[PDB]
Amino acid sequence: LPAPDDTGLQAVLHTALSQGAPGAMVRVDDNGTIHQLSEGVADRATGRAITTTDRFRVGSVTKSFSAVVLLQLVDEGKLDLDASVNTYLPGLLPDDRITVRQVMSHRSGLYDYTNDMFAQTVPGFESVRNKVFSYQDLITLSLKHGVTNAPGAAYSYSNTNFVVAGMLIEKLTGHSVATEYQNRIFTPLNLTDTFYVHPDTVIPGTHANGYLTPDEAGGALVDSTEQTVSWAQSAGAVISSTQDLDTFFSALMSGQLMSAAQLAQMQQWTTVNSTQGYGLGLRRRDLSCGISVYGHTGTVQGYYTYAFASKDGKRSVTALANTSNNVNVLNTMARTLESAFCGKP
Numbered sequence: 001l002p003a004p005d006d007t008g009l010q011a012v013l014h015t016a017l018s019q020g021a022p023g024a025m026v027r028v029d030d031n032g033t034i035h036q037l038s039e040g041v042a043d044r045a046t047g048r049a050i051t052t053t054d055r056f057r058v059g060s061v062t063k064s065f066s067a068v069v070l071l072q073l074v075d076e077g078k079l080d081l082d083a084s085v086n087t088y089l090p091g092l093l094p095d096d097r098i099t100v101r102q103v104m105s106h107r108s109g110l111y112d113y114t115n116d117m118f119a120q121t122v123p124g125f126e127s128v129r130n131k132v133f134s135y136q137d138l139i140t141l142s143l144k145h146g147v148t149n150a151p152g153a154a155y156s157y158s159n160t161n162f163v164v165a166g167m168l169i170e171k172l173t174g175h176s177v178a179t180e181y182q183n184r185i186f187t188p189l190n191l192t193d194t195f196y197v198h199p200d201t202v203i204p205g206t207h208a209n210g211y212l213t214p215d216e217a218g219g220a221l222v223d224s225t226e227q228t229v230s231w232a233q234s235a236g237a238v239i240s241s242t243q244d245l246d247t248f249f250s251a252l253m254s255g256q257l258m259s260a261a262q263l264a265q266m267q268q269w270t271t272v273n274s275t276q277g278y279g280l281g282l283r284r285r286d287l288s289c290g291i292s293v294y295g296h297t298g299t300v301q302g303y304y305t306y307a308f309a310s311k312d313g314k315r316s317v318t319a320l321a322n323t324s325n326n327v328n329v330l331n332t333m334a335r336t337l338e339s340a341f342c343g344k345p
C-alpha cells in the first residue's frame, strides 16, 4: 500500500472541527507502525483535550461484533444462514419466509423502528436516552409497519435486523450478548478498552463526551454522552477505542475469528451504491485509488465512527468525531480512509 498521509489526516480533522465537531481523532496501525492524530476537545465545557486513547460509543460498528458471534455459531452447527428466522425464534415475524442471511445483510424488508424514534433529533434522543427496552419491544415497534419490500429483494438498512441478531445470539447460546462478546471476542483479542454495559449509562474510564447537533442550524449542542443505547443493543451499544477497533478488524480480515468458509460468506457483497457493498454485518468501501477496505461505520448520538481494514488486515484505521447529526462532519471524516490507505496524491 502507499504510505499513510499524516498531513492529509491532520487536514481532515481540522476541517471536521471547522464544520462543528468539538473533537476529532484517528489511529492507523500500518503493519506495526502507528499513526495517531487528534484535534480539539473531549469535553467542550471543561476544555479537556481529545486523545486517541479516549473511549467512545461505536454505534453500528457493534453489528460486526454481533455478526462474528453469529458466524461462530454457524461454524459450531447451531445456526444455518439460509433457515428462517422463525425456525429459531418461533412466531417472531409475520413472514416465516425471512431468513437469517437476509436479516444479516439488510435484505429482509423489516421496517426500521428508529425512523419513528428520531424524526426529530433532540426530542427523539430525550425520549429514548433513559429508556430500557426488551428485544421483543423493539421488534414489536418494527412490526407496527408492514415490510418495505420482498425478502431478499433490495438492500434496505434497518436496526430491526440486528435486534433480531441479538435475539438469536441469546436464544441459541442461553447467554447474554455481553457474555458472548466477552468470551468470543473481547477476552481472546485482549480488547481492554472495549465494553458492552447496557443498560448502564456510564462510559468506563476516560472517554470523549458526545455532542448531538440539533436540527436547527446554529443551535446549541446537547451533551449526549450518557444514555442506555437500549434502542440499539446488539445493533449499536458497544464502547471501544481506536486501538481496539483496529485490533478487531485486523483480526477479522486476517482470518482469526471464524472459519475461512464463514469469512467468505461474510464478504458476499450486496450492492449499496456504486462504491459500497454490504456483506453480513460488514461494509465494503471502494476508495478513489482503486483500493477496497472492509469494516463498518457507526452513528450514535454524539459520535461518528469509521473503522476499516485492508483485505489482509495488515493496515487498519479508526476515526472518531464526537458529534452527530452533522452530515458535513460525517462526509469529511470519511476522507480519513483516503489519506490513510491511498496516501498523498
Ligand SMILES: CC1(C)S[C@@H]2[C@H](NC(=O)CCCC[C@H](NC(=O)C[NH3+])C(=O)[O-])C(=O)N2[C@H]1C(=O)[O-]
Pocket: 058, 059, 060, 061, 114, 118, 119, 120, 121, 122, 124, 157, 159, 212, 236, 297, 298, 299, 300, 301, 302, 324, 325, 326
Ligand atoms: C446506517 C447508519 C448511518 S444509521 C445506523 C445506526 N444508528 C442509528 O440508527 C441512529 C439514527 C439516529 C442518529 C441521529 N440522527 C437523527 O436523530 C436524525 N434525526 C444522530 O445523527 O445522532 C448506526 O450506527 N448506523 C449507521 C451505519 O451503519 O453507518
